[PDB]
Amino acid sequence: MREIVHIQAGQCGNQIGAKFWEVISDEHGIDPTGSYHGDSDLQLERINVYYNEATGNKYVPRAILVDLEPGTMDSVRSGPFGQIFRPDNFVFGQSGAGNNWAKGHYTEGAELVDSVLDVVRKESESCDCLQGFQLTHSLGGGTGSGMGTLLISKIREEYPDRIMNTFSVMPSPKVSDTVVEPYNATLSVHQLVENTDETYCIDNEALYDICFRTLKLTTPTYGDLNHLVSATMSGVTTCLRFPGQLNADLRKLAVNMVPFPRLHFFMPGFAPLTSRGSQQYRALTVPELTQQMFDSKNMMAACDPRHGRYLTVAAIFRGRMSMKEVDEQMLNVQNKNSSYFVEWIPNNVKTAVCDIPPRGLKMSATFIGNSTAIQELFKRISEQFTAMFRRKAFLHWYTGEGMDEMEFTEAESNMNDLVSEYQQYQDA
Amino acid sequence: MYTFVVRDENSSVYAEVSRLLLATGQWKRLRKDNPRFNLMLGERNRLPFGRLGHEPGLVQLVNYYRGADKLCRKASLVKLIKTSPELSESCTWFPESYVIYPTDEREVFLAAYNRRREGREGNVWIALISSEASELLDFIDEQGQVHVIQKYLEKPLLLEPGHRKFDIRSWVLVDHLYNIYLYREGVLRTSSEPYNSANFQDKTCHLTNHCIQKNYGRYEEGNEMFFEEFNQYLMDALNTTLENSILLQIKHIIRSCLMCIEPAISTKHLHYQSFQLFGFDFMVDEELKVWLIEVNGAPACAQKLYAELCQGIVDVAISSVFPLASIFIKLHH
Amino acid sequence: MRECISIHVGQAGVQIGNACWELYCLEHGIQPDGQMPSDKTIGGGDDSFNTFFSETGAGKHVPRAVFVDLEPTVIDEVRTGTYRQLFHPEQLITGKEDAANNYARGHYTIGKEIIDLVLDRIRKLADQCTGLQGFLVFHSFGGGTGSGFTSLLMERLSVDYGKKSKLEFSIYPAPQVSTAVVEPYNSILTTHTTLEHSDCAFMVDNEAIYDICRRNLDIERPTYTNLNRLISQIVSSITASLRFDGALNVDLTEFQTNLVPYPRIHFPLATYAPVISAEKAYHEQLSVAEITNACFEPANQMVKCDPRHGKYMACCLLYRGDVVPKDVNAAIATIKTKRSIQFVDWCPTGFKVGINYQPPTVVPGGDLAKVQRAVCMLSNTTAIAEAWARLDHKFDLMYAKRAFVHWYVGEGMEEGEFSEAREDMAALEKDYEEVGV
Amino acid sequence: MEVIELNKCTSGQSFEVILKPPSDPSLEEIQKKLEAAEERRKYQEAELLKHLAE
Ligand SMILES: Nc1nc2c(ncn2[C@@H]2O[C@H](COP(=O)(O)OP(=O)(O)OP(=O)(O)O)[C@@H](O)[C@H]2O)c(=O)[nH]1
Ligand SMILES: Nc1nc2c(ncn2[C@@H]2O[C@H](COP(=O)(O)OP(=O)(O)O)[C@@H](O)[C@H]2O)c(=O)[nH]1
Ligand SMILES: COc1ccc(N(C)c2cc(=O)oc3ccccc23)cc1O
Ligand SMILES: [Ca+2]
Ligand SMILES: [Mg+2]
Ligand SMILES: [Mg+2]
């Protein structure tokens, strides 16, 4: 277990995907042409997790870029790190998916999926020992959502003993493209519950509110939202990418974070919260990091941690700091809040440290929580689904592609089951 | 903020202690099984000492000394006194005693019993009270349990008016540093019926504890005389003080008992710490010689003294380890 | 002379193995290239150190060791490390996909596929032995490989070498340096499967080692490196009698004979003293009485527990340095009168003592100060069952809700193996209680 | 008190001090259980691929 294969689908998927590669390439010393120009050995020791080595001697992301429309991917190609991607790994159709999960999953996506799997296969064949896959996508559109979940199901069929991991962007009325987002998200959640091992719930509601309430940006763009996403994504993958005292992979993450196979939707958090441009000079103390990383206002999923309990938590501290003081503060916050951590999983809070801080910071903390409070996210989507679905509003966009209302009823029931399955462990 | 757990329901002493810890607001109670506690108020039965002091970044403290049962079971105590050089068979403040098993020191008991009957001096024993060896051993067998046979004290000090028997209860708190603290307030558990040299089957005049006294309540509220009144009596009736005639001996006995088990139970160098509250029961004979009767490992208090003692338990045993934002005589160890 | 084969399984087993072999080389004056100038019989011998080292015609001294991990990166450190020339490449065995902290994956899935190769490489070492007495097996309880694969290997060793002794050096899990939330599962599963196959097992609780490093070495946050240098000193103390001239614990059979009367109750407590910081400017050297007294302090034990509240079945004291019997006996006499030491009624109250006049060797630039005398006490006390109690409770907590169980079931393990393993542990806790109270 | 088994050599000595007197599965069965678990893995995987076929 060395190689991860990365897939990015649709507009959101490709935009957050491109930003992730910009950030991690910078962290690993890699420049737009693929050349290493860094000064630490820690940068290269585990670089094979994400990068292929061409005889070059160039580093090529193990990344496949997928869309049903060309626009966003042309934008990736002419973007900052655009030239670094293997040009054969751009797989795109022409028609788009019209924010329609049925188009992505059943009609338009079906037409393109085999050629994506061909590219997946070529990368997988070149792997010493493939860990599994990470997908970036949103759940509210058509391609990332319908076609992304189609890909996952086809990847699982061909590689049933590999790990599937997603970064899944949840829609919010606060940052909304179409009214059909809750339909697309519910259909997609149904898929994620069955076919991923671990999913980071990146909630556009939370990203918006952080940008507005905390970063004091009166009118957040997608760019501002994505600044938070890429910082979080860098953070959560630190222990996959860098050598440390705990050497992690996608399977060990899943084993230790997921006590029941359906409850695999993580609430990520980050501290210190910053924006692009105006950044703080004031350094953070270990007690301040720890306090901030656990604050509701630092979570990337709009749920109140106090309305539930943590099943498991992984925490990663980056920068030169006292590991002794880290351990003390982490233990302090558990011992002073222990009603919020289930008592039937001993040692359910795990901390790891990496010396390399992210760009522009002296120290940072990244949070990965499996909390029963995530049920709030799913309940919110469920309410929005039902508000339309009770009158069958907007359904003709889906029945026109050959779907039946039964399939909506089934995906709704499965998502409601998930919610009450969370409620079950919040009491005991 | 400190954390604690409660595992003994029936403990009046610790019900009041937890209530007091909550009232400072600087102590939060957790559920029985939450292992992230600073303080355990443990169960009396098979308390899991093995699970304490293994939680990183938590100083842990329990309200029982593991091994203190040696002092607090009647059969264990006799064995301890007899087998410890510190205490010995020569020990002058504990009544001549023998461990008796039924399916063991039965032969040693009978030989000493017959030597008492050489010119026939006072030969009355306790198990429940009898004058001849045969009815004693027959009673023990009727039970199917281990018990102690003990030289019953035939010449007690008898309170006047009323020709009444009594035992003294002393409260002793041993902290985590093995300081031995004697609570300044004791209590006498009185009999209400005149003491009867001739009739050993009548049990309300020979046995003194608070329950088996249901003529009750006649001379003092609930058959409980306190130290002020008892000292007053001793001055008026016997021309001595409680300090001189009784308490010196009480302090000696308590100290000897606890110093003897100290190497076996001390938590000085351990990964968790212990404290415990003991109830020592004393008999006084008519020449004002004190005898130890019982050590109780889970004593209750006298109603009047709950508030003061429980507050004292919090002051010297709990806050000494876990500081916030003397009613005891320290017996020099 | 009778040979011993050392087997190092998983990350913990391998890194500890590295530290032990480094120390063994320093003690016997074997250089990193495998040359031993003081060994005058070139290319052969039946000296005591040949129990652990074979010899080549060129005069290379090669550990009778195999290193196995289900992943390459830890054993790769050995391949390119300062002691790289010491080992034959055949002795260093790696798979590709690890056990993912999952016993079932180390035992069934990934185990099934590498077991035959490991046994073949062990057979190669055993063929070179004139009278192989058996095996020393180093592993964690908590790791997927250290637990899962180890129990598989042990079963197969009982089949292929039924007359041979098997000893364990086992790392018991501690949250302070743990890597997995399922370590209590893996520990109970490996102990159940290994119990019948192990003759004597030395448990080392990472909690005890961690705190010793903090308290006595002033290391603020101990690393695996700190821990393993200390562990290797204790292991060396234990194995010294197999590697040097003497008349106590000379063979593996004698370990069981002297330490294990009742075969299931085979976990002796190790206590070591003194542990003194190399950075300590002024240090008053400790006497035989002081080091021996320290063997009865919970703070110096390999596993934190309270022997005053259990019973001893056996006790060996193993001294290194300037120590004579008279000082040992005088120390014991005064300790007997101050400490609670109670043997079981059906055993003599006594001590087997071994003295080796060579002081402990220390790793140059290490954390441990050189001392004039040291002792390791091995006592079989019922008090070590506190560690089982702790572990069984943690297991019960998770298992009552079946948390994480699906990860094991998905590797082909049946749910029933959990309750089977756990019932065996319940019987073990009872055994200790019957013997000890 | 009583010192027995005194043995001395150049390297050291050993002795005993007494303070007070007293008062497997087959290769076949292993391969069976390993194959049984492999069959549970094959079956659970076949169940998955059938669901994916539907
Ligand atoms: N004392 C010590 N403990 C270690 C070391 N390495 C790992 N551990 C402990 O062993 C446990 C984890 O098991 P590992 O041995 O790392 O796992 P593994 O056997 O390689 O199995 P995988 O799960 O396949 O990686 C944890 O409790 C660690 O604290 C070491 O070098 N020294
Ligand atoms: N955070 C974030 N959300 C996005 C971005 N682009 C689109 N979205 C969200 O994604 C959803 C629409 O899906 P999109 O990816 O545009 O459609 P697709 O191309 O068919 O997959 C809506 O919920 C949008 O709010 C982005 O760059 N960042
Ligand atoms: C609840 O206990 C645990 C949770 C997670 C982990 N592992 C394996 C991690 C893997 C990873 O990719 O990122 C991490 C970052 C910080 C801490 C742990 C992990 C281990 C644990 O015991
Ligand atoms: Ca030789
Ligand atoms: Mg769009
Ligand atoms: Mg490993």
Coordinates of C-alpha atoms in Angstrom, one line a residue, chain A:
Chain A
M1 CA 0.0 0.0 0.0
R2 CA 1.8 2.9 -1.5
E3 CA 0.0 4.5 -4.5
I4 CA -3.2 6.6 -4.3
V5 CA -5.2 7.2 -7.5
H6 CA -6.8 10.6 -7.6
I7 CA -10.0 11.4 -9.6
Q8 CA -11.7 14.8 -10.0
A9 CA -15.2 15.0 -11.6
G10 CA -17.2 18.0 -12.8
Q11 CA -16.9 21.7 -12.2
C12 CA -16.5 21.8 -8.4
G13 CA -14.5 18.5 -8.4
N14 CA -12.0 19.9 -10.9
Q15 CA -11.7 23.3 -9.3
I16 CA -11.1 22.0 -5.8
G17 CA -8.9 19.3 -7.3
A18 CA -6.7 21.7 -9.2
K19 CA -6.2 23.8 -6.0
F20 CA -5.3 20.6 -3.9
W21 CA -2.6 19.8 -6.4
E22 CA -1.3 23.4 -6.4
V23 CA -1.0 23.3 -2.6
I24 CA 0.5 19.8 -2.2
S25 CA 3.0 20.4 -5.1
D26 CA 4.2 23.5 -3.3
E27 CA 4.5 21.6 0.0
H28 CA 6.5 18.8 -1.7
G29 CA 8.8 21.1 -3.6
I30 CA 7.3 20.4 -7.0
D31 CA 6.9 23.2 -9.6
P32 CA 4.4 23.6 -12.6
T33 CA 6.8 21.8 -15.0
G34 CA 7.2 18.8 -12.6
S35 CA 10.7 19.7 -11.3
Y36 CA 11.8 19.2 -7.7
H37 CA 13.3 22.4 -6.2
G38 CA 13.0 21.9 -2.4
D39 CA 15.5 21.5 0.5
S40 CA 14.1 18.8 2.8
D41 CA 14.3 15.0 2.5
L42 CA 10.9 14.8 4.2
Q43 CA 9.4 16.2 0.9
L44 CA 10.5 13.2 -1.2
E45 CA 10.4 10.1 1.0
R46 CA 6.7 9.3 0.5
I47 CA 6.1 11.3 -2.7
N48 CA 5.0 8.1 -4.5
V49 CA 1.7 8.1 -2.7
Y50 CA 0.5 10.9 -5.0
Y51 CA 3.2 11.3 -7.8
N52 CA 4.4 9.2 -10.6
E53 CA 8.1 9.4 -11.4
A54 CA 8.8 9.9 -15.1
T55 CA 12.5 9.4 -16.1
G56 CA 12.4 13.2 -16.7
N57 CA 13.3 13.3 -13.8
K58 CA 9.8 14.7 -13.5
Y59 CA 7.0 14.2 -10.9
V60 CA 3.5 13.7 -12.5
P61 CA 0.3 13.7 -10.3
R62 CA -1.6 10.4 -10.3
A63 CA -4.6 12.4 -11.2
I64 CA -7.5 11.8 -13.7
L65 CA -9.5 14.8 -14.8
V66 CA -13.1 14.1 -15.7
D67 CA -16.1 16.3 -17.0
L68 CA -19.0 16.0 -19.4
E69 CA -18.3 19.6 -20.6
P70 CA -14.9 21.0 -21.7
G71 CA -15.0 24.5 -20.0
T72 CA -13.7 23.9 -16.5
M73 CA -10.9 21.5 -17.7
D74 CA -9.7 24.0 -20.3
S75 CA -9.5 26.4 -17.3
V76 CA -7.4 23.8 -15.3
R77 CA -5.0 23.4 -18.3
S78 CA -4.3 27.1 -18.6
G79 CA -4.3 27.5 -14.8
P80 CA -1.2 27.9 -12.5
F81 CA -0.2 24.2 -12.2
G82 CA -2.0 23.2 -15.4
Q83 CA 1.0 21.8 -17.3
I84 CA 1.8 19.3 -14.6
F85 CA -1.1 16.9 -15.4
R86 CA -0.6 14.0 -17.7
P87 CA -2.5 15.2 -20.9
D88 CA -3.8 11.6 -21.5
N89 CA -5.6 11.9 -18.1
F90 CA -8.0 14.6 -19.4
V91 CA -11.2 12.7 -20.2
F92 CA -14.1 14.9 -21.3
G93 CA -17.3 14.8 -23.3
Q94 CA -19.1 17.8 -24.9
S95 CA -22.7 17.9 -23.9
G96 CA -22.6 18.7 -20.2
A97 CA -25.0 17.2 -17.5
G98 CA -27.3 20.2 -16.9
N99 CA -27.1 19.9 -13.1
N100 CA -29.0 16.7 -13.5
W101 CA -27.9 13.5 -11.6
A102 CA -29.7 11.3 -14.1
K103 CA -27.7 12.7 -17.0
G104 CA -24.5 12.1 -15.1
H105 CA -25.3 8.7 -13.8
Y106 CA -27.6 7.1 -16.5
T107 CA -27.4 8.8 -19.9
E108 CA -24.6 11.3 -20.7
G109 CA -22.2 9.8 -18.1
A110 CA -22.8 6.2 -19.1
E111 CA -21.5 7.3 -22.6
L112 CA -18.1 8.5 -21.1
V113 CA -17.4 6.2 -18.2
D114 CA -15.6 3.4 -20.0
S115 CA -12.9 5.7 -21.3
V116 CA -12.4 7.1 -17.7
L117 CA -12.0 3.5 -16.5
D118 CA -9.4 2.9 -19.3
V119 CA -7.4 5.7 -17.8
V120 CA -8.0 4.4 -14.3
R121 CA -6.7 1.0 -15.4
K122 CA -3.5 2.3 -17.0
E123 CA -2.6 4.2 -13.7
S124 CA -3.6 1.2 -11.6
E125 CA -1.4 -1.2 -13.7
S126 CA 1.6 1.1 -13.1
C127 CA 1.2 0.7 -9.2
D128 CA 3.6 -1.2 -7.0
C129 CA 0.7 -1.7 -4.5
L130 CA -2.4 0.5 -5.0
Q131 CA -4.0 1.8 -1.8
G132 CA -7.2 2.8 -3.5
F133 CA -8.8 6.0 -4.7
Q134 CA -9.7 9.6 -3.8
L135 CA -12.5 11.4 -5.6
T136 CA -13.2 15.1 -5.4
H137 CA -16.7 16.1 -6.6
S138 CA -19.8 18.0 -5.5
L139 CA -23.1 16.3 -4.8
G140 CA -25.4 19.2 -6.1
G141 CA -24.6 19.2 -9.8
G142 CA -24.8 16.5 -12.5
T143 CA -21.3 15.3 -13.4
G144 CA -19.5 15.2 -10.0
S145 CA -22.7 13.9 -8.5
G146 CA -24.3 11.5 -11.0
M147 CA -21.3 10.5 -13.0
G148 CA -18.9 10.6 -10.0
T149 CA -21.1 8.1 -8.2
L150 CA -21.4 6.0 -11.3
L151 CA -17.5 5.9 -11.5
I152 CA -17.3 4.8 -7.8
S153 CA -19.7 1.9 -8.4
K154 CA -17.7 0.8 -11.5
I155 CA -14.4 1.3 -9.6
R156 CA -15.7 -0.9 -6.8
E157 CA -16.7 -3.6 -9.3
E158 CA -13.3 -3.8 -10.9
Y159 CA -11.3 -3.2 -7.6
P160 CA -13.4 -4.5 -4.7
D161 CA -10.5 -4.8 -2.3
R162 CA -9.2 -1.2 -2.7
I163 CA -10.2 1.7 -0.5
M164 CA -12.6 4.4 -1.8
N165 CA -12.2 7.8 -0.3
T166 CA -14.2 11.0 -1.3
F167 CA -14.1 14.7 -0.7
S168 CA -17.8 15.4 -1.2
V169 CA -19.1 19.0 -1.4
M170 CA -22.6 19.3 0.0
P171 CA -24.9 21.9 -1.5
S172 CA -26.4 24.8 0.4
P173 CA -29.2 27.3 -0.5
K174 CA -26.7 30.0 0.7
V175 CA -24.4 29.2 -2.2
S176 CA -26.8 27.6 -4.7
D177 CA -26.8 27.1 -8.5
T178 CA -30.2 25.4 -9.0
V179 CA -33.2 24.3 -7.0
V180 CA -32.5 20.6 -7.9
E181 CA -29.4 20.3 -5.7
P182 CA -31.2 18.5 -2.8
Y183 CA -32.4 15.9 -5.3
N184 CA -28.9 15.4 -6.7
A185 CA -27.3 15.3 -3.2
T186 CA -29.9 12.7 -1.9
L187 CA -29.4 10.4 -4.9
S188 CA -25.6 10.8 -4.3
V189 CA -25.6 10.2 -0.5
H190 CA -27.4 6.9 -1.1
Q191 CA -24.5 5.9 -3.4
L192 CA -21.8 7.1 -0.9
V193 CA -23.3 5.2 2.0
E194 CA -22.9 1.9 0.1
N195 CA -19.7 2.4 -2.0
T196 CA -17.2 4.6 -0.1
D197 CA -15.1 3.6 2.9
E198 CA -14.6 7.2 4.0
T199 CA -16.1 10.6 3.0
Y200 CA -15.1 14.1 4.0
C201 CA -18.4 16.1 4.1
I202 CA -17.3 19.5 2.8
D203 CA -20.4 21.7 3.5
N204 CA -20.8 24.8 1.3
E205 CA -23.0 26.2 4.1
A206 CA -20.1 26.0 6.6
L207 CA -17.6 27.4 4.0
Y208 CA -19.9 30.3 3.3
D209 CA -20.4 31.1 7.0
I210 CA -16.7 30.9 7.8
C211 CA -15.9 33.3 5.0
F212 CA -18.7 35.7 6.2
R213 CA -18.7 35.5 10.0
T214 CA -15.0 34.7 10.6
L215 CA -13.0 35.9 7.6
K216 CA -15.2 39.0 7.3
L217 CA -15.6 38.6 3.6
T218 CA -19.0 40.3 2.9
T219 CA -19.5 38.5 -0.4
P220 CA -17.6 35.1 -0.6
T221 CA -16.7 33.7 -4.1
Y222 CA -16.0 30.0 -5.0
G223 CA -12.3 31.0 -4.9
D224 CA -12.7 32.0 -1.2
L225 CA -14.6 28.8 -0.5
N226 CA -11.9 26.7 -2.2
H227 CA -9.1 28.4 -0.1
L228 CA -10.7 26.7 2.9
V229 CA -11.2 23.4 1.0
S230 CA -7.5 23.1 -0.2
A231 CA -6.1 24.0 3.3
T232 CA -8.4 21.3 4.8
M233 CA -7.5 18.8 2.1
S234 CA -3.7 19.4 2.6
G235 CA -4.2 18.9 6.4
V236 CA -6.3 15.7 6.3
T237 CA -3.8 13.9 3.9
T238 CA -0.6 15.0 5.8
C239 CA -0.1 11.6 7.4
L240 CA -0.5 9.8 4.0
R241 CA 2.1 12.1 2.4
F242 CA 4.8 12.7 5.0
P243 CA 7.0 10.3 7.1
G244 CA 6.2 10.5 10.8
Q245 CA 5.8 8.6 14.1
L246 CA 2.5 7.3 12.8
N247 CA 2.6 6.2 9.1
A248 CA -0.8 6.1 7.7
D249 CA -2.6 4.9 4.6
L250 CA -6.3 5.0 3.4
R251 CA -7.1 1.5 5.0
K252 CA -5.6 2.3 8.4
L253 CA -7.6 5.6 8.4
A254 CA -10.7 3.6 7.7
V255 CA -10.1 0.9 10.3
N256 CA -9.4 3.4 13.0
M257 CA -12.1 6.0 12.2
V258 CA -15.1 3.8 11.1
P259 CA -16.6 1.6 13.8
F260 CA -19.7 0.7 11.7
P261 CA -19.3 0.6 7.9
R262 CA -22.2 3.0 7.0
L263 CA -21.0 5.7 9.5
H264 CA -18.1 6.9 7.5
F265 CA -18.9 10.6 6.9
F266 CA -16.3 12.8 8.5
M267 CA -16.6 16.4 9.7
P268 CA -13.3 18.1 9.0
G269 CA -12.0 21.2 10.7
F270 CA -9.0 23.6 10.4
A271 CA -7.1 26.2 12.5
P272 CA -6.0 28.9 12.3
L273 CA -8.8 30.1 9.9
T274 CA -7.3 32.5 7.3
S275 CA -8.3 34.1 3.9
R276 CA -6.2 34.7 0.8
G277 CA -4.3 38.0 0.8
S278 CA -4.7 39.6 4.3
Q279 CA -3.0 37.1 6.7
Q280 CA -2.1 37.3 10.4
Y281 CA 1.5 37.9 11.6
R282 CA 0.6 36.9 15.2
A283 CA 1.8 33.3 15.9
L284 CA -0.6 30.8 17.5
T285 CA 0.0 29.0 20.8
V286 CA -0.7 25.3 21.2
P287 CA -3.6 26.0 23.6
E288 CA -5.1 28.4 21.0
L289 CA -4.7 25.9 18.1
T290 CA -6.3 23.1 20.1
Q291 CA -9.2 25.4 21.3
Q292 CA -9.8 26.7 17.7
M293 CA -9.6 23.3 15.9
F294 CA -12.4 22.0 18.1
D295 CA -14.6 25.1 17.8
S296 CA -17.9 24.7 15.8
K297 CA -16.8 27.9 13.8
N298 CA -13.7 26.0 12.5
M299 CA -15.7 22.9 11.1
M300 CA -16.2 22.4 7.4
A301 CA -19.6 20.8 7.9
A302 CA -22.3 23.0 9.3
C303 CA -23.2 20.9 12.3
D304 CA -23.1 21.7 16.0
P305 CA -20.6 19.2 17.7
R306 CA -22.4 19.7 21.0
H307 CA -25.6 18.3 19.5
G308 CA -23.9 14.9 19.3
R309 CA -20.9 12.8 20.3
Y310 CA -17.6 12.0 18.7
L311 CA -17.1 8.3 17.9
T312 CA -13.5 8.9 16.8
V313 CA -11.2 11.9 16.2
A314 CA -7.9 12.2 14.3
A315 CA -6.0 15.4 14.8
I316 CA -2.9 16.6 13.0
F317 CA -0.6 19.4 14.2
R318 CA 1.9 20.9 11.7
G319 CA 4.9 23.1 12.4
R320 CA 7.7 23.2 15.0
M321 CA 6.0 23.1 18.4
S322 CA 6.2 21.1 21.7
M323 CA 4.8 17.6 21.1
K324 CA 4.7 17.4 24.9
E325 CA 2.4 20.5 25.0
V326 CA 0.4 19.1 22.1
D327 CA -0.2 15.8 24.0
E328 CA -1.1 17.8 27.2
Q329 CA -3.6 20.1 25.4
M330 CA -5.3 17.3 23.5
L331 CA -5.6 15.3 26.7
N332 CA -6.8 18.5 28.4
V333 CA -9.7 19.2 25.9
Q334 CA -10.9 15.5 26.2
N335 CA -10.7 15.4 30.0
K336 CA -12.7 18.7 30.2
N337 CA -15.4 17.7 27.6
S338 CA -15.6 13.9 28.0
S339 CA -19.4 13.7 27.7
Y340 CA -19.0 14.6 24.0
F341 CA -16.7 11.6 23.4
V342 CA -18.3 8.2 23.5
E343 CA -16.9 6.3 26.5
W344 CA -17.2 2.9 24.8
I345 CA -14.4 3.4 22.4
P346 CA -11.2 3.8 24.6
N347 CA -8.5 6.2 23.3
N348 CA -10.8 7.4 20.5
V349 CA -8.8 10.6 20.0
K350 CA -5.5 10.2 18.2
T351 CA -2.9 12.9 17.5
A352 CA -0.1 13.0 15.0
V353 CA 2.5 15.7 14.3
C354 CA 4.4 16.8 11.2
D355 CA 7.3 19.3 11.2
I356 CA 6.5 20.8 7.8
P357 CA 3.8 23.5 8.3
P358 CA 1.6 24.6 5.4
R359 CA 2.5 27.6 3.2
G360 CA 2.2 31.0 5.0
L361 CA 1.8 29.6 8.5
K362 CA 4.1 28.8 11.4
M363 CA 1.7 26.3 12.9
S364 CA -1.7 24.7 12.1
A365 CA -4.1 22.1 13.3
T366 CA -6.3 19.9 11.2
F367 CA -9.3 18.1 12.6
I368 CA -11.0 14.9 11.3
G369 CA -14.1 14.0 13.3
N370 CA -16.5 11.1 13.1
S371 CA -19.4 12.8 15.0
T372 CA -23.0 11.7 15.3
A373 CA -23.9 15.4 14.9
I374 CA -23.3 15.0 11.1
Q375 CA -26.9 13.8 11.1
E376 CA -27.8 17.5 11.1
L377 CA -26.3 17.9 7.6
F378 CA -28.3 14.9 6.3
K379 CA -31.5 16.0 8.0
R380 CA -31.2 19.5 6.3
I381 CA -30.8 17.9 2.8
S382 CA -33.7 15.5 3.7
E383 CA -36.0 18.5 4.6
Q384 CA -35.1 20.3 1.3
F385 CA -35.6 17.0 -0.7
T386 CA -39.1 16.4 0.9
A387 CA -40.2 20.1 0.4
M388 CA -40.0 19.6 -3.4
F389 CA -40.6 15.9 -3.6
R390 CA -44.0 15.9 -1.8
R391 CA -45.3 17.8 -4.9
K392 CA -43.1 16.0 -7.4
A393 CA -41.7 19.4 -8.3
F394 CA -38.9 19.5 -10.9
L395 CA -39.1 15.7 -11.3
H396 CA -39.6 15.8 -15.1
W397 CA -35.9 16.7 -15.5
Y398 CA -35.2 13.2 -14.2
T399 CA -38.1 11.1 -15.6
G400 CA -37.2 12.5 -19.0
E401 CA -33.9 10.6 -18.7
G402 CA -35.7 7.4 -17.8
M403 CA -35.7 7.5 -14.0
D404 CA -38.7 6.6 -11.9
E405 CA -40.0 8.3 -8.7
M406 CA -39.4 4.9 -6.9
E407 CA -35.7 5.6 -7.1
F408 CA -36.2 9.0 -5.3
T409 CA -38.3 7.3 -2.6
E410 CA -35.6 4.6 -2.1
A411 CA -32.7 7.1 -1.8
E412 CA -34.7 9.3 0.7
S413 CA -35.5 6.2 2.9
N414 CA -31.8 5.2 2.9
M415 CA -30.6 8.7 3.9
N416 CA -33.3 8.8 6.6
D417 CA -32.0 5.4 7.9
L418 CA -28.5 6.8 8.0
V419 CA -29.8 9.7 10.1
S420 CA -31.5 7.4 12.7
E421 CA -28.5 5.2 12.7
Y422 CA -26.5 8.2 13.9
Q423 CA -29.1 9.0 16.5
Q424 CA -28.8 5.4 17.8
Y425 CA -25.1 5.9 18.9
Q426 CA -25.6 9.4 20.2
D427 CA -27.7 8.1 23.1
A428 CA -25.5 5.1 23.9

